[PDB]
Amino acid sequence: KRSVLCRESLRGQAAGRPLVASVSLNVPASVRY
Amino acid sequence: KRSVLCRESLRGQAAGRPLVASVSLNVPASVRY
Amino acid sequence: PQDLEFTRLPNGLVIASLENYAPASRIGLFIKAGSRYENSNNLGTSHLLRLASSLTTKGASSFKITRGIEAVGGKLSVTSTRENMAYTVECLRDDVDILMEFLLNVTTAPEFRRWEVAALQPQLRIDKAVALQNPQAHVIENLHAAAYRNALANSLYCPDYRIGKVTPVELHDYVQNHFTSARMALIGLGVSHPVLKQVAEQFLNIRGGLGLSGAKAKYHGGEIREQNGDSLVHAALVAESAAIGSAEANAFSVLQHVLGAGPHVKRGSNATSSLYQAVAKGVHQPFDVSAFNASYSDSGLFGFYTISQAASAGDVIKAAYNQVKTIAQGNLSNPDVQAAKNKLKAGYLMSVESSEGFLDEVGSQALAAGSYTPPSTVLQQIDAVADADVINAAKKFVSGRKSMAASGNLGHTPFIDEL
Amino acid sequence: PQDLEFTRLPNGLVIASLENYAPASRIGLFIKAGSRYENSNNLGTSHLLRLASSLTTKGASSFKITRGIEAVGGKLSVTSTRENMAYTVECLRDDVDILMEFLLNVTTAPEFRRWEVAALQPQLRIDKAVALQNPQAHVIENLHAAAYRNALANSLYCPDYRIGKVTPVELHDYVQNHFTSARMALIGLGVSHPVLKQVAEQFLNIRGGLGLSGAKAKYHGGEIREQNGDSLVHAALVAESAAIGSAEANAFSVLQHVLGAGPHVKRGSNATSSLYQAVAKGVHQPFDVSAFNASYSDSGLFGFYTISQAASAGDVIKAAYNQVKTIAQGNLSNPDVQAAKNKLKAGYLMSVESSEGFLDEVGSQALAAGSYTPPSTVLQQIDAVADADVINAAKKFVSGRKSMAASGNLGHTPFIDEL
């Protein structure tokens, strides 16, 4: 968990073709937009 | 868990004054309507 | 022999008493704190309070309190609803005094120790877990939270994310603001009123106005849907009933019964239940369904409950609706209202044919009205309902903002727009 | 040097190729199975499918697969969305062949063995837990299930109750129906098309029509609210966007950007973002907000996303609305549309400035259209948007069925009737 206290917040989702694209890879792993 | 396969089902809630009354007692314990 | 005896004090707490014949006396202090008294920041503190009734208090250590009641074979039940919180106390005629001094400690002298309250915490999960075993509980709960927005949509059971986070100051503050004189009603089933009062006067004089929790009512049509893997699906459909102890309300109650399907016969099917008939005809073999009817101080919820299978969910659900539409189209013959009535009357009487029943009924009334309405009078009121009145109330469900809650495989569960 | 080269076969699977200069080649078979292809009984299956990429298959054992790609330093990514499922495959120029034969087994020869699939199961929880750490995912998910009813309302992560219940015939069935020829599009970033085709022809010829899962779209306004203990609250407000690759859509996108607040500067605040300005003025010091814009084949979702603190939730939420209402009232000057546009255009180009980006863009297009639209053309389309057009679209959010999702302390989060 990372503290979200300041002005820094800049997370909201909206890309061109991909939207909420979840990766699962044999090595790495993640969640994007 | 108790199987609820037959005609027997007869549970639905509606009493006079009390409605969805939950008891916690030092000895016994339960959930009524 | 002697009938009850209410008495409102200067504080505004109510007290009753009935020296009965039989060997068993039962006190019960009903404090007005339901689950509707918590906010977003206070949710789940009644729940914990309910479960902390054996903890150390000012005059009696948790050990004494439990071993004490054991000593004597008593029971201490702490029941609560969305509007009230009955603190029951049973025991033998001769031991009420030992027991009462326990109820008093538990309720006016709670000492929520960081360490003690901390051990409990986990009990909440265990308690929640066992109560959520009956689909009824989570659906019924979900119902309240969708149909209300603010106060009565708070559930009885602590929210998963709050469990360990219910702090001592929280309990201490809830007691302080809600467990007060104006909201309380003593009630004895085998105690002397003269000696009850004395005690009530000596121990129940605490100040605290209403709504330091944030009292207020409001209804809001909404739908909470819980998908599962279970064959069966439960769903509730409910619109604002009439309020508590009001004519409209009463009406609803009577209508409720015209459709209301709580089997009066073991292994028996209802011939009386319209809903059941109607549903039944358009429905499959295995299913079950019942009229739901809730009434609280500042709003109600009336409508029905269903238990179908995956692909019947809709059929049942609509079928039920349609039938309740029928009554609201006006179609309802006199014969059925009178049966209903007599069904209800019978019911209420049986409800109060027990000590525990009576003691609840009495306290209950104490918190609403401020006195005890006798049964007879009660009975008259229900009878006054008009055969039309019923229809009229029923008109209101069909033409009242809908609010539904279902569980199970929801491929075949109508949404708001579906019905 | 050589530009891509699409080719639809008799099966209907597309394939492209670009012999680039640089050392790294990347294939990626995009099959048309998204989350939207599961039913009440099949939910959570793509998820597991996504996580089960390294299991034994007909020609290569889980061990060889993994150890094999490691051997050469390759990566195998298996990415999915609500609509599609890209199976990426990176490696060194020389090793494509060893790698390709891996991609082909994984995708056309999966062997879900009771024992293997079973040990995976628990991975689902671990994966769900790690992606549910970003409020964005649970809200954004909650959004899609509120706003839809049936198909796209299905979430990407397996439902808690389903986890261990994901059975091997499920996986086998899902592959069989959805991982087929008509729904596939090969894409190479450093491979020969001539040799690509041959392979495609030899290994990608399987039959399976669409919608054996239950394809179809539908939008339904609804609200999913998740109470928390966290200071901050996130909520999404969104109305049926325009569909994928259509003019209306495109318009939305441009509009999106006029309000759209994805910082282009580190530690920098937007001057351009209307939403941000308007919100900002009526809002407190710490807060953040941005324009949300989703587009799928048979429906879209446009609106905004907010992150406010407990008491500020509404103020921000309405603020943002009010501002987007302004554009819908007509109030929008030419100077801002052109900026927007250029913002968009610059973004789409940077989106495709990378191998990974390009490869996605291309496959993506192959599942929608059936061919590759070049950038330029793309750029032209976005420019064609009228300054009015934008307004008009906007007019549609304000006058289009609302659908919201929030998380955190919801004392101060407007409901549907609130705004």
Contact D40 C410 (CB under 8 A): yes
Are D4 and D372 spatial neighbours (Cβ–Cβ below 8 Å)? yes
Give chain A positions within 8 Å (CB) of D89. Answer: none
Sequence-separated (6 or more) residues with CB below 8 Å from residue D240 = D147, D219, D299, D300, D301, D302, D396, D400, D401
**In Å, what is the CA distance from C133 to each residue of A28, B3, C99, C130, C308?**
39, 12, 33, 5, 18
Sequence-separated (6 or more) residues with CB below 8 Å from residue C329 = none
What six digits make up the tokens of C135? Answer: 């689909």
DSSP state of D97: H
Contact D294 A23 (CB under 8 A): no
Helix then strand then coil, in percent of chain C rounded to 5, is 45, 15, 40
Q: Which residues pair with D188 in a beta bridge?
A: D17
Contact D136 A33 (CB under 8 A): yes
The number of residues making up chain D comes to 419
Sequence-separated (6 or more) residues with CB below 8 Å from residue C108 = C179, C203, C204, C206
Contact D165 C411 (CB under 8 A): no
> Which structural domain, as residue segments, surrounds residue B17?
1-33
The letter for the amino acid at D409 is: N
Domain locations in chain C? 1-215, 222-419
Give chain D positions within 8 Å (CB) of C229. Answer: 161-162, 165
- The radius of gyration computed from the CA coordinates of chain A, to the nearest angstrom, equals 13
Nearest residue, CB atoms, C409 vs list D40, D149, D165: D40
Are C96 and C50 spatial neighbours (Cβ–Cβ below 8 Å)? no
Cα D11 from chain centre: 26
Residue in A3, A8, A10 to test binding to D, most D beta-carbons within 10 Å: A10
Query: What's the CA gap between C234 and C142, in Å, rounded?
Result: 12
The letter for the amino acid at D376 is: S
Are C50 and C105 spatial neighbours (Cβ–Cβ below 8 Å)? no
| Total domains present in chain A | 1
From the CB of residue C11, how many other CB atoms can be counted at a distance below 10 Å?
17
DSSP string computed for D269-285: --SS-HHHHHHHHHS-S
Contact C415 D40 (CB under 8 A): no
Query: What's the CA gap between C15 and D81, in Å, rounded?
Result: 64
Give the CATH number for residue B13. Answer: 2.10.210.10
Query: What's the CA gap between D92 and D99, in Å, rounded?
Result: 9
Sequence-separated (6 or more) residues with CB below 8 Å from residue A10 = D262, D263, D288, D290
- H-type alpha helices, D179-304: 193-203, 247-259, 274-282
Q: Which of C315, C346, C139 is nearest to C234 (CA)?
A: C139
HEC string of B10-31?
A: CCCCCCCCCCCCEEEECCCEEE
The letter for the amino acid at C89 is: V
Token pair 């792993």 is at which residue?
A29
DSSP string computed for C268-286: PPPSS-HHHHHHHHHS-SS
Are D236 and D160 spatial neighbours (Cβ–Cβ below 8 Å)? no
D134 vs A: CB within 8 A: yes
The letter for the amino acid at D283 is: V
Query: What's the CA gap between D234 and D405, in Å, rounded?
Result: 8
DSSP state of D57: B
HEC string of D311-328?
A: HHHHHHHHHHHHHHHHHH
Query: What's the CA gap between C28 and D303, in Å, rounded?
Result: 54
- The radius of gyration computed from the CA coordinates of chain D, to the nearest angstrom, equals 23
Q: Which residues pair with C303 in a beta bridge?
A: C238, C292
Are D79 and A29 spatial neighbours (Cβ–Cβ below 8 Å)? no
Nearest residue, CB atoms, C40 vs list D41, D161, D410: D410
Contacts 24+ apart (CB under 8 A), D340-345: D340/D254, D340/D255, D340/D257, D340/D258, D340/D260, D340/D390, D341/D254, D341/D257, D341/D382, D341/D383, D341/D385, D343/D257, D343/D260, D343/D264, D343/D272, D344/D253, D344/D254, D344/D257, D344/D382, D345/D379, D345/D382, D345/D383
Query: What's the CA gap between C198 and D376, in Å, rounded?
Result: 92
Overall resolution, Å: 3.0
Token pair 């339904």 is at which residue?
D220
Nearest residue, CB atoms, C127 vs list B8, B21, B24: B24
Nearest residue, CB atoms, C229 vs list D39, D165, D310: D165
Q: Is C229 helix (H, G, I), strand (E, B) or coil?
A: coil
Are D161 and C229 spatial neighbours (Cβ–Cβ below 8 Å)? yes
Q: Is C408 helix (H, G, I), strand (E, B) or coil?
A: strand
- The radius of gyration computed from the CA coordinates of chain B, to the nearest angstrom, equals 13
Query: What's the CA gap between A14 and A20, in Å, rounded?
Result: 8
Q: Which uninterrupted H or E stretch holds C342? A: helix C334-351
How many Cβ pairs within 8 Å bridge chains C and D? 38
- The class of domain C1-215 in CATH terms is alpha beta
Tell me the shortest Cα–Cα distance from D181 to chain A, in angstroms: 22
Please report the residues numbered 12 through 31 in chain D whose beta carbons come closer than 8 angstroms to any beta carbon of chain A.
none
How many Cβ pairs within 8 Å bridge chains A and D? 114
**In Å, what is the CA distance from C7 to each residue of A22, C189, C366, D297?**
67, 15, 10, 71
What six digits make up the tokens of C73? Answer: 């074979």
Reported as half-sphere exposure (CB side, CA atoms, 13 A), residue B8 has a value of: 5
**In Å, what is the CA distance from C4 to each residue of C18, C403, D328, D341?**
5, 41, 67, 80
Residue in D224, D227, D401 to test binding to C, most C beta-carbons within 10 Å: D227
CB environment D185-206: b (16+ within 10 A), e (fewer): bbbbbbbbbeebbebbeebbeb
Query: What's the CA gap between C46 and C174, in Å, rounded?
Result: 8
Query: What's the CA gap between C370 and D382, in Å, rounded?
Result: 71
Q: Which of D149, D182, D114 is nearest to D39 (CA)?
A: D149
Sequence-separated (6 or more) residues with CB below 8 Å from residue D197 = D7, D15
What six digits make up the tokens of C230? Answer: 């279970």
CATH topology of domain C222-419: Cytochrome Bc1 Complex; Chain A, domain 1 (3.30.830)
Q: Is D183 helix (H, G, I), strand (E, B) or coil?
A: coil
Are D312 and D232 spatial neighbours (Cβ–Cβ below 8 Å)? no
D149 vs C: CB within 8 A: yes
Query: What's the CA gap between D254 and D260, in Å, rounded?
Result: 9
**In Å, what is the CA distance from D365 to each residue of A17, D182, D184, D245, D372?**
9, 14, 12, 9, 6
User: Which strands, in side-by-side order, build the sheet including D288-296?
Assistant: D223-227, D404-408, D232-239, D299-309, D288-296
Sequence-separated (6 or more) residues with CB below 8 Å from residue D304 = A12, D236, D237, D238, D259, D275, D289, D290, D291, D292, D320, D324
Burial of C224 from C-beta contacts in 10 A (0-12 / 13-18 / 19+)? buried
Query: What's the CA gap between D56 and D53, in Å, rounded?
Result: 9
